């Protein structure tokens, strides 16, 4: 059975975002004419939220809980799939494949990834996705 699904959490193995976690938002298992290899559009996080503990102020928690996201198309052999899955919405009208021609649309794709990731992080769910991989 195929596992490269649009809910799967993967690890990035190469590039600038190496060692960072992403969620597949659109897999393409058989290559397009421009990208002959099997690939996937993912939407991950660049800057992990910092360690937030008690005996801290409320405006400081909102400062440590700041997620910076990224949107990128990756080859499959540059990805490390996990068993973990997250049910994040990520509506596909704003996060898609012709995002990589207009930088303003890439800003909106990163913004829409960022707001949903911060909203999911402030509920205490999918907590393995938001801790950095120690390597």
């Amino acid at each position: 059975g195929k596992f490269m699904k649009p809910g799967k959490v993967v690890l990035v193995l190469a590039g600038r975002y190496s060692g960072r976690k992403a969620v597949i938002v659109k897999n393409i298992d058989d290559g397009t004419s421009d990208r002959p290899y099997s690939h996937a559009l993912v939407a991950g996080i660049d800057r992990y939220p910092r360690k937030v503990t008690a005996a801290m102020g409320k405006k400081k928690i909102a400062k440590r809980s700041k997620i910076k996201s990224f949107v990128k198309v990756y080859n499959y052999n540059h990805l490390m799939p996990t068993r973990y899955s997250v049910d994040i919405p990520l509506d596909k009208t704003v996060v898609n494949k012709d995002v990589f021609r207009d930088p303003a649309l890439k800003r909106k794709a990163r913004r829409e990834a960022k707001v949903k990731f911060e909203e999911r992080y402030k509920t205490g769910k999918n907590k393995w996705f938001f801790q950095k991989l120690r390597f």
Binding site: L13, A14, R16, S18, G19, M80, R83, F135
Partner: protein, 114 residues
Amino acid sequence: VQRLTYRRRLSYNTASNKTRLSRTPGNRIVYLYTKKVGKAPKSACGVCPGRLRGVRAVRPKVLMRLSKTKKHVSRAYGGSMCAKCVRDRIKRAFLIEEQKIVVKVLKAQAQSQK
């Protein structure tokens, strides 16, 4: 044929007293004292025999002059470790951490029945 002499008082062919020939606007051949050849950094993994890419090979005190983008690669462990041993350490750090969760689950699986 114009035979040429040293321009400094060190008359011995040591490692620091290395020269090269140069043709001059006055139409004569001079010695130019060269600098030692630099080396790219070796990877921090310790297994790859090749040197790192994207970093200029200079003498160590030249690295004061150079900007940061000439001294590293935009990656985690960039300019200090090769990409092969970065991704082979990402996989290792993920998989051993997963296997520890498997061992933790199988511990409670034994303690549940016993």
